Amino acid sequence: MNQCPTDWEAEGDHCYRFFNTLTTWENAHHECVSYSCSTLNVRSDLVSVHSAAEQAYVFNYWRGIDSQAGQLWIGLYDKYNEGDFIWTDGSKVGYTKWAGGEPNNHNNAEDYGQFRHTEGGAWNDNSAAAQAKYMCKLTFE
């Protein structure tokens, strides 16, 4: 039994939804936020990841459905303070899974976090021009 809205998947205290469409981090951020609902205090946002179980759940959900090589935008960013990656949903950043050599802020223009499709979804920072698939998460505040 779960109480997730239709088309959303239950794990723990949260609901998740994969969108199999290439888009920019900024557009994915709006798309996710667009599912919020103030009357039930539901905040929707890009996924934030807080444990190895949450990382795997999200990665396997994604790859269960998308077998193309490519990346998955997450809610991790350093736009407002270069070098300090935080979550858009305001949750704490205890869990990290950086790919080797990442984050590298490559050409001083990478502020937006994404899973790779390899190494269990190891993270990369990428640019505002780049495109990827995305995943949203509900928080019941």
Q: How many residues bind a copy of itself (CB under 8 A)?
A: 24
Closest distance of CB 14 from ligand MAN, Å: 27
Q: Which residue, 78, 128, 129, is CA-closest to 104? A: 78
Q: Which of 36, 91, 105, 127 binds a copy of itself (CB under 8 A)?
A: 36
Cβ atoms within 10 A of the Cβ of 133, count?
A: 22
| Interacting residues with a copy of itself between 38 and 57 (CB under 8 A) | 39-42, 44
Contact 91, 77 (CB under 8 A): no
**Given the complex with a copy of itself, which of 39 and 68 has the nearer CB atom?**
39
Q: Which of 20, 26, 37, 109 binds a copy of itself (CB under 8 A)?
A: 37
Cβ atoms within 10 A of the Cβ of 84, count?
A: 9
- According to DSSP H, which parts of the chain are helical? 25-33, 52-65
**Given the complex with a copy of itself, which of 9 and 78 has the nearer CB atom?**
9
Q: Which residue, 74, 100, 72, is CA-closest to 85? A: 74
Binder of residue 82, out of ligand MAN, Ca ion, a copy of itself, none (CB less than 5 to 8 A by kind): Ca ion
Is residue 85 part of the contact set for Ca ion (CB under 5 A)?
no
Is residue 14 part of the contact set for a copy of itself (CB under 8 A)?
yes
Q: Which residue, 135, 137, 139, is CA-closest to 60? A: 135
Is residue 45 part of the contact set for Ca ion (CB under 5 A)?
no
Binder of residue 3, out of Ca ion, ligand MAN, a copy of itself, none (CB less than 5 to 8 A by kind): a copy of itself
CA dist 55 and 58 (Å) reads 5
